[PDB]
């Protein structure tokens, strides 16, 4: 597994990153941070500092039990300023917990998942065949695969639009 | 006293307008409406059909007891597409109920008002002197005044960003 860290420079200023830069939640207030072109100024998003041009890579994401997270991967060109749709068309390929149910975020309609309570999810990115896949860690049961002809650097993606949920990288 | 009606062409498609076009609340889902350039496609806002370039006018607004509403006036050039900040610099001058607190929506910090409860508010717009003012109807007690050098037409503005509250024009 790749050893990843959240990129502070990308993080929506309302997000609180943990000291070790693996954990993320939504804060009560917009922090006063440098306005880097790479920082998401509206959508509640953060990328990992490491993105990938080729090869097979995987990592694990610990997930909160309550609504409000989405995670997976984003293309480097995902727009950082103004309200962006959270869709494959706008460069995001992700799972989401919303309305007490798990989804793969397709558009125009989201795709329901068929899993129990998720605690930890292995993300596997294959830039050779052009795919991102999600597995429930307990017994690596398959949750979902996006097939994508990725034509640029791809970054691990994390989003939290509610207080009282979270995401956290492992290892 | 001006008899205003809400302009359904401007209304965000999640908003539910009353048949006499006095009242507004937020609906659970977006309606499919003609995408006029004047329509707010993201912010939960609606304008009155009548705007004012000069003179002095006033009207009244019944307000829900619960969080989610904001009202006052907007300059015509308020951007209709994408997420706009709800601030004076972006062409909005409003009172807001949020977190059980009554606010004059100044920026970068909002201004908390001392008023315990509001049933009905009088908005007074004066383009001669260049100000917009709010009064509690009970005994016309002054709540707040924005001083604005208004350089274009100015519309009554209404916003409801959660279910379980409402606004309604009087008369």
């Amino acid at each position: 597994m790749v050893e990843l860290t959240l990129d502070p420079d990308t993080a929506n200023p309302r997000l609180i990153l943990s000291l070790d830069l693996k954990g993320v939640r939504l804060g009560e207030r917009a922090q006063d941070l440098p306005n880097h072109p790479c920082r998401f100024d509206t959508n509640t998003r953060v990328l990992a500092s490491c993105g990938f041009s080729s090869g097979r890579h995987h990592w694990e994401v610990e997930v909160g039990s309550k609504d409000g997270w989405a995670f997976g991967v984003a293309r480097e060109s995902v727009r950082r300023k103004g309200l962006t749709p959270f869709t494959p068309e706008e460069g995001v390929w992700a799972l989401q917990l919303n309305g007490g149910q798990y989804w793969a975020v397709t558009s125009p309609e989201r795709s329901p998942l068929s899993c129990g309570h998720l605690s930890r999810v292995r993300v596997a990115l294959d830039l050779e065949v052009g795919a991102v896949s999600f597995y429930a860690v307990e017994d690596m049961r398959h949750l979902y695969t996006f097939r994508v002809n990725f034509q640029e650097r791809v970054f691990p993606l994390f989003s939290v639009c509610s207080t009282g949920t979270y995401l956290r990288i492992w290892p | 006293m001006v008899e205003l009606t809400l302009d359904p062409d401007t209304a965000n498609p999640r908003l539910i307008l009353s048949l006499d076009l006095k009242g507004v609340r937020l609906g659970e889902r977006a309606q499919d409406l003609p995408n006029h350039p004047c329509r707010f496609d993201t912010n939960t806002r609606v304008l009155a059909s009548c705007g004012f370039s000069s003179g002095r006018h006033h009207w009244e607004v019944e307000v829900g007891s619960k969080d989610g509403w904001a009202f006052g006036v907007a300059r015509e050039s308020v951007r209709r597409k994408g997420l706009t900040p709800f601030t004076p610099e972006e062409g909005v001058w409003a009172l807001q109920l949020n977190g059980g607190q009554y606010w004059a929506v100044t920026s970068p910090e909002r201004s908390p008002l001392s008023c315990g409860h509001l049933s009905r508010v009088r908005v007074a717009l004066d383009l001669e002197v260049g100000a917009v003012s709010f009064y509690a109807v009970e005994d016309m007690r002054h709540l707040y005044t924005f001083r604005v050098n208004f350089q274009e037409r100015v519309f009554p503005l209404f916003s409801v960003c959660s279910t379980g509250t409402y606004l309604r024009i009087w008369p």
Binding site: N43, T44, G68, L83, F86, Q96 | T44, S162, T163
Partner: peptide
């Protein structure tokens, strides 16, 4: 409700 639009 509307919070999910900022995802």
């Amino acid at each position: 409700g509307l919070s999910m639009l900022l995802q």
